[PDB]
Design a protein around this nucleic acid. Structure first.
Lengths: 156, 64, 107
RNA sequence: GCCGACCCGCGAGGGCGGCUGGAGGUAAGGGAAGUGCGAAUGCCGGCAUGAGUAACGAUAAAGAGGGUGAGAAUCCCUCUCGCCGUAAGCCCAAGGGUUCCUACGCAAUGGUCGUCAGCGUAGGGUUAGGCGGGACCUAAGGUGAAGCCGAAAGGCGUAGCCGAA
RNA sequence: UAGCGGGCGUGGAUCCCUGGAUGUCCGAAUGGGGGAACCCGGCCGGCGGGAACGCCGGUCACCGCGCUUUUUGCGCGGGGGGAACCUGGGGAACUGAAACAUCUCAGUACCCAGAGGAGAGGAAAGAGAAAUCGACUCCCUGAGUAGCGGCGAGCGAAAGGGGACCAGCCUAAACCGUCCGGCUUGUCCGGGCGGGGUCGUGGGGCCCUCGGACACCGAAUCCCCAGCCUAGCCGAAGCUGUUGGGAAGCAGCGCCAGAGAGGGUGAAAGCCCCGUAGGCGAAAGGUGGGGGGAUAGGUGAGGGUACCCGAGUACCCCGUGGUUCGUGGAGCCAUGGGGGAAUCUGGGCGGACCACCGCCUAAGGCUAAGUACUCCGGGUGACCGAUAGCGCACCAGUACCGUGAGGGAAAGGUGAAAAGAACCCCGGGAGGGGAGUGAAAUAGAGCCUGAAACCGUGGGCUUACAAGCAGUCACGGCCCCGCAAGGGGUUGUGGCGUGCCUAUUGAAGCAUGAGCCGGCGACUCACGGUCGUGGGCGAGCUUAAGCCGUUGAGGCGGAGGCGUAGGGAAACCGAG
């Protein structure tokens, strides 16, 4: 701001017998780098969201996908090993082309890795769910680990 | 952040369990002598209202 | 330290912009500014006609500095990425299924 | 950005076209704000207004000839002319630090010009056993071992010490 | 920073990474001077044919500590630097209650000195009412309650409890020897030493009965190993056609992936390149109880005693300050002064005090953690983008300004690479004119864009009978677009026509600011309530810190707050 200027409190002008305007110390927003006023700061955008309604949304989100019928929870996979070929062939198994999205859901280190580089395979897993993620994406790939995750998440 | 909440007002007022700003009469001490029980019983209590709503914004947090 | 590009000092092929699709001579590497040149940008430079080092009419040039990431490795095969190898005596870099890199001096 | 005699909105504005320009842009659905100028004798910036006008810095003054160079009353070489001489001549202390000296140079600075410099680029120059100051002296004064005192800082301060035209 | 130039690299160079030499003089400066980089010497060696001059190397400051026969010294340390974070001796005023002296900013700036990656504190002479808790810092909440006040503005506890974190040992005095001086040689005044012991259910000293012990707690102490920091290393996968100066683009076919993070490349690239995901490494200097060892050390009953158990202290009174506490019944507690004990029958609180009753051990110390801050470093952004962002994107804490203190700036762009325009023409050059060059030469050397203000060239149109907020309306004349009708704009004739903004009951005003034009430019942030509302739950709604988790990843966590009953000053009653 206008007080934390790398200058001083020097009131150079008098007030009376001068010429042009009337000013205190150089530090004022009426000049150059002279501190601005009320603007941008390294602040904090944050607040609270009641679990109930919040988790309503959680359920509701996957529920909205459960309102279009775009999900699947495979047990064991053909692409268990974190290599691309097998996982793609298995994507052909489940019925997945090459222009979609993979908020997958599922919890398997192997799976997440191979599916991390593959372009349209943004990959999501369950210990940290997200409803933004499902709205923007589309494929609850699943193990019931993530579904059982849903259960104790929205229990009530 | 945490503000004062003023206890002068609190130490001389009492709203009616909602927001109807109500209290005590004004004008004792320097009367008496020349009168009777008339204004005596009548000094008892008071109503208070209208601008005491602004006064109701004055007090704030505690309610009480 | 930290100038480990992908070039050394011999011969390689070209895919640039000026004359994209040629090949590189001995390849004078100078400097660490990624400037590289073989016979590439053979334009024409001035230089005054003065009697000293210059003829009565000074107006000629040849090879001229150029960008480094404009070329690709090769070997007795075609021209593929150079993957390195421990010779357990020295250390060079073979080629996809095939071979040669610095293997002209007992490598 | 430029230009517009075309399209759209009651409007701020939105679209299309060509030239300039050469590597970005960012819908619809949303959102986060240094966000909208024309003034504040605004901060700044650029540039005009008077304006070919007042002035070229003490009313002691130049002339020619010749020379140089693209360019001369403006520099220079000699003939000629006036002004000072308690100073307007010479020195020292002071201060300024290459300004010096020379070859060249005018784009600046010079209150025009300038081949000229006191400016410029580069080189080259400042010699002490005797001058002058330091390997000698103190004065006012200061610092300061000691000492007195101050909450802190430090004040006060003997012997000593730096100290001068 | 180009160069001349003459030299070094697979008998392995620049180079970074490590240690060491070098480290001249100034600099707390330090022999001693002293105006900052100069000068003067006592001393040991060295050099000059070297005594007389000079340098080379060695030395030479002050305060605080123990030994040193007071001796000379020997060993020790010391000062001065520092952005903010912490502690202390003192210490303002601006302002604020719209006045002003108490109350306020404020113990904030300031001065000095100190201390450390932490500081500070810490084992209860504690809370305060639980006959209950159980060392210290931070947080949240208790609660803005309690409580203070020209009862004015305003100032603000802790206990509670839920979290971050958890660490515990000694002294003095008693007491037992031992060494040294004195001396009223005493069975003595003390002190240099060692063991003795540390208490709040009171402990122990010492003396006697138990049996008093290998083991046992094991360090904050020493010793290591794994692991971290300052050079590096492997690295998935593409080939052709094409517009062009350049393709990566659009197309064909093929591939890569623990790698689609980004940057480069003449442009927009997973597949060309540093690298990414992942995986891997150190001789040198430093880091580490995590695993471990050992070491320092620390662990047991009872009788009698009765020795001690912190002295100008505790305690009283006057002058004090903190604590929410302003003179209040003021308690505790920190101390200017005067006064002045005790040894567990010892003494500090429970808000004067008395009583009771609980609480509790002073007047001698120490202790990691958690906590804070940000110059330097990495991380990384609904952060800015050459008047912004630091005043500094560049030879900026620099040009310039004050005697100095101090004030302090303005300022980024050719290309992809200089290929930076050779040869020639006007000139004295400066600048141009042909060239070459590159896609591009209004990309040509201050070189992306290049508005307007402001200054100019030709030409198309008007204006010399004219009275003016210069504009607008009808018409016409002219020049150029339009096939048509139309239209540009030039402005002769007439109808009309009292500047912009401020301040005013009221202005074109001779009450005011403005040269023009360009830009930076002013209603905001966490929370605190209030009305509304779009939603959730609805007699129920909701978490704080903080914890597992994230590589832009969620979840959790009942401490606490409120709504449900109000009312009485209270005691208390109670839909009364």
């Amino acid at each position: 701001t206008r007080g934390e200027v790398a200058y001083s409190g020097r009131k150079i002008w008098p007030q009376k017998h001068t010429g042009r305007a009337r000013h205190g110390d150089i530090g004022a927003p009426i000049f150059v780098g002279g501190g601005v006023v009320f603007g941008p700061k390294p602040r904090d955008y944050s607040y609270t969201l009641p679990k109930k309604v919040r988790k309503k949304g959680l359920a509701m989100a996957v529920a909205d996908r459960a309102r279009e019928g775009k999900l699947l929870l495979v047990e064991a996979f053909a692409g268990v090993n974190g290599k691309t070929k097998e996982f793609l062939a298995w994507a052909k198994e489940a019925g997945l082309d090459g222009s979609e999205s993979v908020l997958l859901v599922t919890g398997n280190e192997l799976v997440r890795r191979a599916a991390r580089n593959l372009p349209w395979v943004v990959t999501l897993a369950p210990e940290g769910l997200n409803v933004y993620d499902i709205v923007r994406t589309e494929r609850l790939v699943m193990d019931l680990d993530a579904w059982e995750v849903f259960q104790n998440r929205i229990g009530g | 952040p945490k503000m004062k909440t003023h206890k002068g007002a609190k130490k001389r007022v009492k709203i009616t369990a909602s927001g109807k700003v109500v209290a005590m009469k004004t004008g004792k001490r320097h009367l008496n002598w020349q009168k009777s029980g008339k204004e005596i019983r009548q000094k008892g209590r008071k109503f208070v209202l209208a601008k005491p709503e602004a006064e109701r914004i004055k007090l704030l947090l505690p309610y009480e | 330290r930290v100038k480990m590009h992908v070039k050394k000092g011999d011969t390689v092929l070209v895919a640039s912009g000026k004359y994209k699709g040629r090949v590189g001579k001995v390849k004078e590497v100078l400097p660490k500014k990624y400037a590289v040149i073989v016979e590439g940008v053979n334009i024409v430079k001035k230089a005054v006609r003065v009697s000293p080092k210059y003829p009565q009419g000074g107006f000629i040039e040849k090879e001229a500095p150029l960008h480094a990431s404009k070329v690709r490795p090769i070997c007795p095969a075609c021209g593929k990425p150079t993957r390195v190898r421990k010779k357990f005596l020295e250390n060079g870099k073979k080629i996809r299924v095939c071979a040669k890199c610095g293997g002209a001096l007992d490598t």
